[PDB]
Write an enzyme that holds these catalytic residues in place. Structure first.
Site, PDB file in Angstrom:
ATOM      1  N   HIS A 279       7.428   9.720  -0.590  1.00 28.43           N
ATOM      2  CA  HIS A 279       7.038   8.624  -1.472  1.00 28.43           C
ATOM      3  C   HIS A 279       7.691   8.746  -2.842  1.00 28.43           C
ATOM      4  CE1 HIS A 279       4.284   9.750  -4.806  1.00 28.43           C
ATOM      5  NE2 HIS A 279       4.157  10.872  -4.120  1.00 28.43           N
TER       6      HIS A 279
ATOM      7  N   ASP B  12       4.873  11.576   4.979  1.00 29.52           N
ATOM      8  CA  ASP B  12       5.383  11.438   3.616  1.00 29.52           C
ATOM      9  C   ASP B  12       6.141  12.697   3.193  1.00 29.52           C
ATOM     10  OD1 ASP B  12       5.954  10.803   1.020  1.00 29.52           O
ATOM     11  OD2 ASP B  12       3.872  10.624   0.352  1.00 29.52           O
TER      12      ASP B  12
ATOM     13  N   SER C  46       4.230  15.251  -7.677  1.00 27.62           N
ATOM     14  CA  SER C  46       3.859  15.479  -6.285  1.00 27.62           C
ATOM     15  C   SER C  46       4.072  16.919  -5.816  1.00 27.62           C
ATOM     16  CB  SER C  46       4.653  14.517  -5.397  1.00 27.62           C
ATOM     17  OG  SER C  46       6.043  14.654  -5.630  1.00 27.62           O
TER      18      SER C  46
END
Lengths: 52, 162, 162
Positions: free
Chosen positions: B40, B62, B114
């Protein structure tokens, strides 16, 4: 021409699904590890065409 | 206080600080001949070896797997397929792994970061950060783990992209 | 500094210096009634028991299996099927087993020395060297491992014969 064109599109669609199924089922096994159940679960599940 | 001499200092370089248009948005790491990078997120993969490599983008996981060359195979980070529930090492703090749920101190860390290759107390890798859920009690977070062979993922309810 | 009293010195002779035209190109070892020898290397097996022995040449595994007689089983070397990822013993240095990846320091060791029956920190044999890979930062290598029963092999991408 119409029948031939329909025949190709279905074949192309069928080939499209087969490759997609390979990607979906091969990505999980091959993220960290190289481990693919040497054709015991490589045939039944998805394409065993992974090199390994 | 100063009890930090774990693998974080040993490796210290697996973090590639993915930067979109020069803005660090994520962090890429390496595990067992593979490269981990959230799908993502997006940005620069400046490292030429990693820059010219093809990743998957499975949204169900992801993740961006890879086949890294030998150029990192000593700049690597061990992993695990098992989770001894408890405390694990982190970059911006610590990891508090309750029974079947990851969490960090409320308001700790930040979003838009992330990767964060969370580290274990033995000096190894057991999780990678994906998101963060700030409930009234504490802060949960979406992450990715590794089963015996399956590379699965977990995303607690109410968790946003972090 | 001096912490080397492991199985390397206990056996000290499992290693035979396979010589092609008298030039030592690889190394042959012994493991639990078997004799290991890299396939891609060639030379002299002067030891009579091993000199007149027939090996397989499965390039898929790049090994030369064999059966060792009783009189040389006194000179043996125990082994393992499980890999406690970490640091292991070596002839030319050390072994940083990262997550499912053998590696050594940048530029350490040398090519043309395939075998190198890497030794365990418990005084056993857990890996045989085959190849080597020296890209930008540090070094990897191609080696053989043993699963529960099957004898596999691993070769990092971009690894050349060493």
């Amino acid at each position: 021409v119409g029948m031939s064109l329909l025949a190709l599109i279905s074949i192309f669609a069928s080939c499209y699904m087969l490759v997609a199924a390979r990607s979906k089922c091969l990505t999980p096994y091959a993220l960290t590890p190289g481990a693919a159940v040497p054709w015991t679960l490589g045939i039944l599940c998805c394409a065993p065409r992974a090199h390994a | 206080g100063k009890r930090e001499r774990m693998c974080m200092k040993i490796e210290n370089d697996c973090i590639f600080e993915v930067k979109h248009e020069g803005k660090v948005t994520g962090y890429a790491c390496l595990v067992g001949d593979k490269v981990m990078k959230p799908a993502h997120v997006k940005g620069v993969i400046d490292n030429a070896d990693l820059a010219k490599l093809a990743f998957k983008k499975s949204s169900k996981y992801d993740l961006e797997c890879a086949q890294i060359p030998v150029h990192m195979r000593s700049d690597a980070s061990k992993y695990t397929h098992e989770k001894p529930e408890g405390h694990y090492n982190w970059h911006h703090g610590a990891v508090q792994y309750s029974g079947g749920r990851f969490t960090i101190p409320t308001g700790a860390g930040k979003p838009g970061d992330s990767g964060r290759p969370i580290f274990d107390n033995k000096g190894r890798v057991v999780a990678i950060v994906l998101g963060g859920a700030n409930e009234g009690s504490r802060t949960a977070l979406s992450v990715v783990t590794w089963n015996k062979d399956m590379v699965t993922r977990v995303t607690p309810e109410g968790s946003e992209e972090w």
